Amino acid sequence: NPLLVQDVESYDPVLNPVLNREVRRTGGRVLITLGDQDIDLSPSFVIFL
């Protein structure tokens, strides 16, 4: 789902892999390591700060 995030002056470093597109493709899935858990990154995801 598209996401709009306000107050970027309080930026959360949890978004660093998401902004850097540090994805791990394995078995047809696109994995993003937000924090300590793996998440299937849907291609339709988009974030605006």
Partner: protein, 48 residues
């Protein structure tokens, strides 16, 4: 099947039939003795 099947294939034809049948769904062959069984099971449980 309702319960997960247990295949008895001394000739080895059933296992290759299984690999061919579920190849389109990215089937993975593993074993109980392998130390990677934990991660394979965990990946299967979360991503099909």
């Amino acid at each position: 099947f309702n319960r997960y099947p247990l295949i008895i294939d001394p000739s080895g034809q059933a296992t290759e039939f299984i690999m061919n049948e579920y190849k389109d769904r990215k089937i993975t062959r593993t074993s109980f003795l392998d130390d990677a069984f934990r991660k394979n099971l965990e990946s299967a449980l979360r991503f099909g």
